Amino acid sequence: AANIMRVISIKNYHSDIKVIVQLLQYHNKAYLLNIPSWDWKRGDDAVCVAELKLGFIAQSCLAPGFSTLMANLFTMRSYKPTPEMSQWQTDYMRGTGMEMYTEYLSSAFNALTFPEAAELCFSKLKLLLLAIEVRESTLAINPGPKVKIENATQGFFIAESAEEVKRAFYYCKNCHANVSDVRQIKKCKC
Amino acid sequence: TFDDAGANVPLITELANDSNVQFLDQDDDDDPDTELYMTQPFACGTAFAVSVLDSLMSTSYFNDNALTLIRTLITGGATPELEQILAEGAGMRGGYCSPAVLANRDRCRVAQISLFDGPLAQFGQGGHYGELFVYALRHFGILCIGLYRFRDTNPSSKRYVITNPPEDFPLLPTDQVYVLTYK
Amino acid sequence: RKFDSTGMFHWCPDRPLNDCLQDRSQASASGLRNHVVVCLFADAASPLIGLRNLVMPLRASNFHYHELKPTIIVGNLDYLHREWKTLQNFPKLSILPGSPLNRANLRAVNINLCDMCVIVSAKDRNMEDPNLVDKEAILCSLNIKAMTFDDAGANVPLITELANDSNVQFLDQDDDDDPDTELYMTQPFACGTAFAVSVLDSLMSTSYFNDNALTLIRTLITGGATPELEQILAEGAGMRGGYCSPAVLANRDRCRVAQISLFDGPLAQFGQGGHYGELFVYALRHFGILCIGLYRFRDTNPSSKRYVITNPPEDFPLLPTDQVYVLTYK
Ligand SMILES: [Ca+2]
Ligand SMILES: [Ca+2]
Ligand SMILES: [Ca+2]
Numbered sequence: 001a002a003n004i005m006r007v008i009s010i011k012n013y014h015s016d017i018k019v020i021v022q023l024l025q026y027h028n029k030a031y032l033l034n035i036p037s038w039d040w041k042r043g044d045d046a047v048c049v050a051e052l053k054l055g056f057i058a059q060s061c062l063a064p065g066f067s068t069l070m071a072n073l074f075t076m077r078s079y080k081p082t083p084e085m086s087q088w089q090t091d092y093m094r095g096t097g098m099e100m101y102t103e104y105l106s107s108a109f110n111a112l113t114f115p116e117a118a119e120l121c122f123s124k125l126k127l128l129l130l131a132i133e134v135r136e137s138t139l140a141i142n143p144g145p146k147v148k149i150e151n152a153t154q155g156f157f158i159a160e161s162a163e164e165v166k167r168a169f170y171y172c173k174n175c176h177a178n179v180s181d182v183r184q185i186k187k188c189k190c
Numbered sequence: 191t192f193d194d195a196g197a198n199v200p201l202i203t204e205l206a207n208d209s210n211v212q213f214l215d216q217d218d219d220d221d222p223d224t225e226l227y228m229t230q231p232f233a234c235g236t237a238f239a240v241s242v243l244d245s246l247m248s249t250s251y252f253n254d255n256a257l258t259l260i261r262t263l264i265t266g267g268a269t270p271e272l273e274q275i276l277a278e279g280a281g282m283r284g285g286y287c288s289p290a291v292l293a294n295r296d297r298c299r300v301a302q303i304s305l306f307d308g309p310l311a312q313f314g315q316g317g318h319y320g321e322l323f324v325y326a327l328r329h330f331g332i333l334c335i336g337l338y339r340f341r342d343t344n345p346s347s348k349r350y351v352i353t354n355p356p357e358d359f360p361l362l363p364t365d366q367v368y369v370l371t372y373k
Numbered sequence: 374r375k376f377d378s379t380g381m382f383h384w385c386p387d388r389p390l391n392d393c394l395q396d397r398s399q400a401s402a403s404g405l406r407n408h409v410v411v412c413l414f415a416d417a418a419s420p421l422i423g424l425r426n427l428v429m430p431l432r433a434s435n436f437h438y439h440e441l442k443p444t445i446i447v448g449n450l451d452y453l454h455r456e457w458k459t460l461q462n463f464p465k466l467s468i469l470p471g472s473p474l475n476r477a478n479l480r481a482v483n484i485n486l487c488d489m490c491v492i493v494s495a496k497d498r499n500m501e502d503p504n505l506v507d508k509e510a511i512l513c514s515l516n517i518k519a520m521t522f523d524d525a526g527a528n529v530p531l532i533t534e535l536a537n538d539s540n541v542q543f544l545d546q547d548d549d550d551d552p553d554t555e556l557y558m559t560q561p562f563a564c565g566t567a568f569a570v571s572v573l574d575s576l577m578s579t580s581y582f583n584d585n586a587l588t589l590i591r592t593l594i595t596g597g598a599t600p601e602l603e604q605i606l607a608e609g610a611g612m613r614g615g616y617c618s619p620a621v622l623a624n625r626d627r628c629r630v631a632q633i634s635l636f637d638g639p640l641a642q643f644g645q646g647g648h649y650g651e652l653f654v655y656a657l658r659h660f661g662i663l664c665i666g667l668y669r670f671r672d673t674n675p676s677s678k679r680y681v682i683t684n685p686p687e688d689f690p691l692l693p694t695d696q697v698y699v700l701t702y703k
Contacts, residue, residue, distance in 0.1 A: 001508050008511065008543050012550060020250045030277040031474070034516040036527075036546070040270055043254060047246045053204065055264035057238055060202055063302045065235035065338045067202070068351045069368060071242040072227060074249055074260065088341050088350055092233045095336065095353035100249075100256050115327050122323050128354050130333065130370065131259060139258060141298040142333050142370040156259055158335070158354045279477040 004031050011037045018043035026051045072096045079160065101165040102156050105132075108173035109149045114142070117149050121157070125167045126182045131156040198347050203231075205239040217346075233350045234341070267297055298370045302338065305365050313361055320357035322367065331372060338366040374438050377462070377614035378605055380621035381597040383432045383441065384614040385464045390457045394468050395445075397481035403467075405445065406486045412473035412517075413448030414494040414509045417455075422495045425459040426595075432463050433596030434625040441465055445482050447473045452495065462612045473513050476520065485522040485529055492533040507540040514544055528677050533561075535569040547676075563680045564671070597627055628700045632668065635695050643691055650687035652697065661702060668696040 007021050015037040023029055026048050038044045056067040072095065079097030081090060109117050114132065121129040131141045133154040140147060159165045171177050172188035205211055211229045212220040214237055218230040231237035250257050261268070275283065305314035305322075309329075313322040319334070326332040337352040339362065349366070352359075377384045395403070409431065411424070424446070431442055443465040446453065450470040460466060471478050473492070484490060492513050500506050510533050518527045535541055541559045542550040544567055548560040561567035580587050591598070605613065635644035635652075639659075643652040649664070656662040667682040669692065679696070682689075 001505055002502075004512070005504050005508060005543075008515070012543050012546065015546070020247060022247065029273070031512055031516075033273065033277045034512070034519045036515055036519050045250050045254065045257065047243070047250065047257070049240050049243055052243050052246070052260075052264065053238065053240055057202055057204065059264055059300060060235060060238075063300050063368060064200060065349065065351050066300055066368065067238050068232055068235040069336055069353055070260065070264070071238075072351075072353060074256075075227070075242065075245040076248075077227075088339070089228075089233075091339070091352050091355070092350055093228075095351060095355070096227060098353045100253075100259075102253050102256055115331060118333065119324060119327055122320075122357070126357070128333070128335065130335070133255065139255060139262070141259070141262070142331070142372065144331055144372060154255075156256060277476070279475040 001028070004028065004035075007032060007038075008035055011035055016042070020045050020047070022046075023048045024050065073098065073100050073158065075099065097160050098158050099161070100156060101159055101162055102154055103165045103169050105149055105153045105155050106169050106171045106173075107151065108171050108175075108177075109153070109168075110151055112149045113145045114140075114147045114149065115145055118142075121155075121168060124177070124182075125171060125185075127165060127168055128158040129155050129168075130158065201236050203237050205237060208239045208241050211237050211239070230341075230348075234348050235338075235351060236348075263298075263300060266299075267294070296372060298372055300335075301369050301371050302366050303332075303369055305361060305367060306363055310367075311363070314363040314365065315361075317361050318357065319355050319359040319361060322361070323357075326369070333370045334367050335370065336368045337361075338368065340364055375615050376434055376617050376622070376625075377602070377612050378617075379599060379601050379614075380617045380624050381434055381599065381602060382429060382612070382614075383434055383436070383438065383464055384462050384612060387461045387611075390454060390461075390468065393466055394450075394470070397469070397477060400445065400467070400469050400481040401483070405443065405483045407488045408443045408445060408483075408486070410482050410484055410487045410490040411444065411446040411448070412490060412492045412513055413446055413452075414473065414496055414513075415449045415452035416496060417449060417451035419452055419495045419497065421456055421459075422493065423459070424456055425463075427491065427493075428460060428463045428466065429598065430594065430596040433627070433629070434622075435596070435627045435629055438464075442488055443467070445469060447471070447478050447482060458611070462614070474509070474516055476516065479517065479520065480522075484517060484520070485525055487529065489530045489532060490517065492531065494534065494536060498536060503537050503539070506536045507543075510535065511540060511543045531566050533567050535567060538569045538571050541567050541569070560671075560678075564678050565668075565681060566678075593628075593630060596629075597624070626702060628702055630665075631699050631701050632696050633662075633699055635691060635697060636693055640697075641693070644693040644695065645691075647691050648687065649685050649689040649691060652691070653687075656699070663700045664697050665700065666698045667691075668698065670694055 003021055003023065007019055010017055010019055021032065023046050029046050029048055032038050032046055056070060060067040076099055077096055079094050081093070085093070105117070109120070112120065118129040121127045131139060132143065132149070134140050134147070135150060155168065157165050157168065167182060167185040170185055170187050175190070176188040177185060203214060208226040209222055211226060211231050212222070214231045226232050226239055226241060229237070246257065303310065305311055310322060310326065313325065319337070323334045326334055336354055338349045339352060341348045341350050343362070375384045376382065411427065413424070428444060431444060441464070445467040447469050453468055469478060469482060473479070492510050494507070494510050496509070498506055514531060514533050517529060517531060520526055533544060538556040539552055541556060541561050542552070544561045556562050556569055556571060559567070576587065633640065635641055640652060640656065643655065649667070653664045656664055666684055668679045669682060671678045671680050673692070
C-alpha cells in the first residue's frame with residue numbers, strides 16, 4: 001500500500017517518468033494497473049517478488065534445478081577461482097559468473113536462420129544466443145529455421161560480461177574474423 | 191522410510207531468512223561468512239530465498255526486455271492481456287478456443303534431457319559439451335544452456351547446476367542437460 | 374405515496390435487508406440509470422458514519438416519486454447490517470456486497486450511467502500514517518477514472534470524501550500540486566469533486582454570530598429535517614410515518630437548490646453573449662427563480678471538469694455551455 005502510494009505520487013508529479021516498483025504480493029499489482037498512467041509499453045514495471053519466487057520454484061518442478069540457473073543468471077558476478085575450493089565448486093562458480101546481456105547482431109548475421117546464427121555464436125564468438133527481438137515489436141525464444149536474422153536484430157545472450165557480448169556486434173564475417181583467440185575480435189575497417 | 195526413498199526424494203524449500211540454509215543439509219561445511227548463492231543447497235537447487243531476486247530492479251532499468259524474457263519463461267506465458275483480464279475482477283475466463291489463438295500452444299519450454307540413453311547418449315560417453323550443443327541445435331532444434339551434474343562420483347543423489355559450460359568441457363553419461371525446446 | 378410523520382421525507386415500512394440485497398446479476402439486470410452509487414469502505418467493526426444523512430436529502434418530499442434518484446450502496450455486508458436499522462424506511466434503495474475497488478461490482482451497477490458516485494470511507498484513523506489514511510479513496514477514484522465502458526472513464530461524476538486534506542493532490546492531474554496550498558484553493562475542491570471535513574470548522578463561528586444562517590444551511594442541506602423530526606428520532610422508535618394529512622403535505626413544497634442549463638430552453642437567450650445580470654432579473658421575474666452562481670467548464674477552445682463561481686458580478690459574461698445554480702419552488 002505504501003509503495004502504491006509512492007507510485008501514485010511520482011506519476012501525479014509527471015506522467016512520463018518510467019517507474020519500476022517492487023511489490024510483495026501479486027494481489028496488489030492490480031491496483032497499479034489502474035493508476036491512470038501506468039503504461040507497460042512505456043517501461044513501467046512491477047517486479048513482484050511473489051510471482052517471481054513462486055514462479056521460479058514452479059519451473060524447478062518441471063526441470064529440477066532451474067531456479068538456481070536463472071537466479072544466478074540475473075545477478076552480476078565476476079568469476080573468482082581460489083585454492084581451498086573443490087572441483088565441483090569451481091565448475092559451479094564459473095557458471096555463476098555468467099549473466100544475461102543483450103546486444104545488436106552485426107551485419108555479418110544478416111539473413112542467417114536463427115539456428116545457424118546461434119551455432120555461429122557458440123562456435124566462433126564463444127557466446128550463447130537464446131532469443132531475438134523480431135520487428136510491430138515481439139520477443140522470440142529459440143525460433144526455428146523459419147525465422148531469419150534481419151538487419152539490426154537485437155539478440156539476448158549468456159556471457160561472462162558486457163565486454164564479452166560486444167564481439168557479436170564487431171564480428172565482420174570472413175572480411176576479418178578468422179583467428180581463434182576470440183580476444184582478437186575488435187571493430188573492423190569495413 | 192518407504193519400503194514395500196528418504197533423502198532421495200526431490201525437495202525445494204522456500205527459506206524466509208537466507209542464513210537458515212545451513213540447516214537444510216549435512217556434509218556441506220556450513221559457514222555464515224558465505225553468501226546464499228555459494229551454499230551447497232542453493233548450488234543443488236533445493237533451496238530458494240527471495241533475496242536472490244533483489245538484483246531484478248537493476249536488470250529492469252538496464253534491460254527491460256531481459257525481464258520480459260524471464261517473465262515469459264517462468265510464468266509459462268502470462269502476457270499483459272492476461273493481467274488486464276485478471277484486473278477486471280472476474281477471475282480467469284475461458285473456454286474452448288479458436289484454433290487461431292490455440293496457435294500459441296506452441297512455445298519454448300525449459301526442459302531436461304538425460305544423456306544416459308537416447309540419440310544424444312553418444313556425446314555422453316566422453317564427448318565434450320560443445321559437440322552436443324552443435325549436434326542438438328542442428329538436428330533437434332534444441333539449445334543446451336547448462337548441465338545438472340552429480341556432486342559425488344567414484345555417492346549421494348545430490349546434483350549441481352553448471353550454467354553454459356566451456357566448449358571443451360567433458361561430459362559424463364550420468365549428466366542431465368537443461369534445454370530450450372519447441373516440442 | 375407514504376411519508377414520514379412530519380411529511381418532510383418519502384417513507385416506507387420497515388423491511389429486512391434481504392429485500393434490498395442484490396448480487397451482480399440482479400444489479401446488472403435492473404435498469405440502473407441516472408442513479409446514485411455510494412462506494413463505501415468499511416470493516417465489519419468500523420464506527421457508524423450515519424449514511425442516513427446521505428440518503429435522507431435524496432428523499433425530500435418536494436421531489437415527485439418518479440424523479441427520486443434510486444440509490445445503490447457498494448460495500449461490506451456486515452457493516453451494512455449494523456447501519457440498515459437507520460436506512461430501512463427510505464424507498465428505492467439497494468445493496469451490493471463486496472469491495473468498491475472490484476471492477477465487476479462497479480460495472481454491474483452501471484457506474485458509467487450514474488448521476489454521481491460518492492466515494493466515502495468509514496475505516497479508522499487509528500492508522501498512524503497520514504499518507505495511507507486515504508489510500509482506498511484515492512485508489513477507488515483513480516480506478517473508476519481508468520475504466521472503459523464501450524458498447525466513459527474520466528467523464529463519470531465523482532465526489533470523494535477525503536480524511537486528510539493534503540491527499541487532495543492525488544485525486545487529479547494537470548493541476549500543479551503544491552502542499553503550500555490550502556484545500557479550498559485546490560482544483561478538485563474548486564471543481565466540487567473533493568470534500569473534506571476541515572471546511573466545516575468555521576461553522577462554530579457562524580453559529581455564535583448568526584444562528585439563523587446555520588438554520589438556513591441545515592434546512593437546505595438536510596432537505597428539511599426540522600426540530601420535530603430529531604425529537605421523533607430521539608424517542609428511539611425510528612422514523613414513523615404513513616400516508617399523511619393533506620394538511621402536513623402542504624410542506625411538500627419547499628425550495629430546492631437546482632441546476633439549470635443555459636444551453637436550451639427559455640433562458641438560452643441569455644446564454645449567447647448575455648451577462649449574468651440579465652439572467653438574474655429575467656429569471657426571478659418570469660420564473661421565480663434566484664440565480665446564486667455558475668458551474669463553468671475549466672477548459673474552452675478540452676476536459677469535462679467544471680468549476681464553481683459564487684454570485685458573479687452583474688456585468689459577468691455568460692457562455693452557452695454554462696450551468697446555473699438556482700433556488701426554485703417547483
Ligand atoms: Ca559475470
Ligand atoms: Ca549444513
Ligand atoms: Ca494533482
